[PDB]
Amino acid sequence: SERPSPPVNLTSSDQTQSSVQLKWEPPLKDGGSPILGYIIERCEEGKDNWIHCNMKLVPELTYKVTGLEKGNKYLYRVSAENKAGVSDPSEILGPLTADDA
Amino acid sequence: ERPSPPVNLTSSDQTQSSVQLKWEPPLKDGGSPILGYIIERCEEGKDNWIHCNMKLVPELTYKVTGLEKGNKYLYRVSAENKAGVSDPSEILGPLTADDAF
Amino acid sequence: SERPSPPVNLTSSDQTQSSVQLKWEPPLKDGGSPILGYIIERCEEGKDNWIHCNMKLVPELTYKVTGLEKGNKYLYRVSAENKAGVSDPSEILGPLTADD
Amino acid sequence: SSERPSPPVNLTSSDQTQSSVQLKWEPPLKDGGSPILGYIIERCEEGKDNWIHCNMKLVPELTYKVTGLEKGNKYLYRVSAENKAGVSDPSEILGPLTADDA
Amino acid sequence: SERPSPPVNLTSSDQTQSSVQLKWEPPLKDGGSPILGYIIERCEEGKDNWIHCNMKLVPELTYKVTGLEKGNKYLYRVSAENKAGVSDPSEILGPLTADDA
Amino acid sequence: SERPSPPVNLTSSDQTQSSVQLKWEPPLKDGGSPILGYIIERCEEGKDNWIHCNMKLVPELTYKVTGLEKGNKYLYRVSAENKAGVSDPSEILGPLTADDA
């Protein structure tokens, strides 16, 4: 009937100089319609614009962000989409630095 | 004394007739170990909370069954020790009883 | 360039009369440098002092606390460290009773 | 261009009576790029599964007195924010709160 | 019917060497019965036991703690009571040092 | 003996085309020393840099941000300082648009 609530508990792992593994939990409210997938966005320091990380909807609760530039800091957020619309983005993750560890 | 509520109640494997719930233990056990958990659900179109499990669930997960296809459900979980039962966790849902994804 | 933010969602499992397994998620902000490891602290009821549990940094997101006294209640908190410094401790977990 | 704002936060109550309650909240942390025009207050009674609009016109303030409560009943409350782009998700739910004198 | 939920958003102001002004918001859930009042407790560092500050229930949403010792650090928590019982305490405030601004 | 915790519940009111009134609550933990004051920072969209708004520490729990440009979006955060050091900034407030209500 309506858009779902935001995904919750966005977290990270496997941070490298060029990628990072994001993980989250599903919305607490689906808005009355099943979740079709998720939209991952990232924002780099030095730019005020949020970029889409996945082209097609991600049906998983995890996603590997790629294309990171070494030494840069990045913010991350993830939204959920159903037939009714797209949720507000989760709470922002980051700044996380693109370094090997 | 009674423990604090369970935290971070989440879901997975939503079907037309069931859903897998998962949570984390209380941050405070009130001075006595947790004996188990009490799972409750509430359907839309009805104002009463129903007990899902008969005996206490000692695990941190539980499969709710007996859902009606297409209906929306709320969920909450409490923790019990020798002293009493905690307040319920944060409410999960509305979640629609449909085969997800 | 600066200290990271606290670890988040500190939780517990596998509580025994002498040990407990702690688990957490990494800081939301690393302060510009990778996380080197974590510092686990505990505080017993009947004492107002926080104690370090691990000597060397824990690079993992989990750690088994040992040496607990039967029947006692304990508080727990974990911090993250990078080359710049140590974060504020996470939200306090506990009191958790040391019983099987 | 713009988008809906984030939900109002910290919805709380005061002056609970047999027939009314004073609701209070804080503005969204994100306005979506356009000023907040006002707020939409909703309530849900126990014994009914439907959310009801309490105010007809938008409330521009950060407070609003809900009236028409039935003595002894329990009520849930939530508030949303609206700008030119749309209406936010409702805040976290307040209640059940019983309409009774101390 | 049942005990209320904990008071929320416990905060402070007007910290002195002998007192502090506490303020909070009412429970999100009253358990089906009005809140009769609140119970303020404090715990000093160097002592492991929580002490009751007020004898009679406080019907207001604020209360001035007195009798603090200069230089000492204190923890604070507040509970709500209705005809059914007393809630879990709010989130703990402090350590706050008993010193003049 | 150590820095305080971040200020909490940073909120806004009286948004205009050139100013906004910020308000917050004191740290939950003062680190064992009184709070000397607060440091207010803002960041404009289209720029990745946080700017200090106040020169001298603000002892109050509120502050009027000025110098905003009409139509621009701004982020805000506030830190607390004692004799031991400066806290991590509070949770970020914004984006909030500089426009007359």
Numbering used by the authors:
A (entry chain D), E (entry chain A), F (entry chain C): 3 to 103
B (entry chain E): 4 to 104
C (entry chain F): 3 to 102
D (entry chain B): 2 to 103
What does the paper behind this entry write?
Titin is a protein expressed in the skeletal and cardiac, or striated, muscle of vertebrates that plays various roles in muscle structure and function. Encoded by the gene TTN, titin spans half a sarcomere (the basic contractile unit of muscle) and has various functions including preventing sarcomere over-extension (Gautel and Djinović-Carugo, 2016), acting as a molecular ruler for thick filament formation and as a hub for numerous signalling molecules (Kruger and Linke, 2011, Linke and Hamdani, 2014). Fn3 domains are only found in the A-band region of titin, where they are arranged with Ig domains in a pattern termed super-repeats, which themselves are repeated. Fn3 domains have a characteristic beta sandwich fold, with a core of hydrophobic residues as the “filling” between two beta sheets that pack against each other face-to-face.
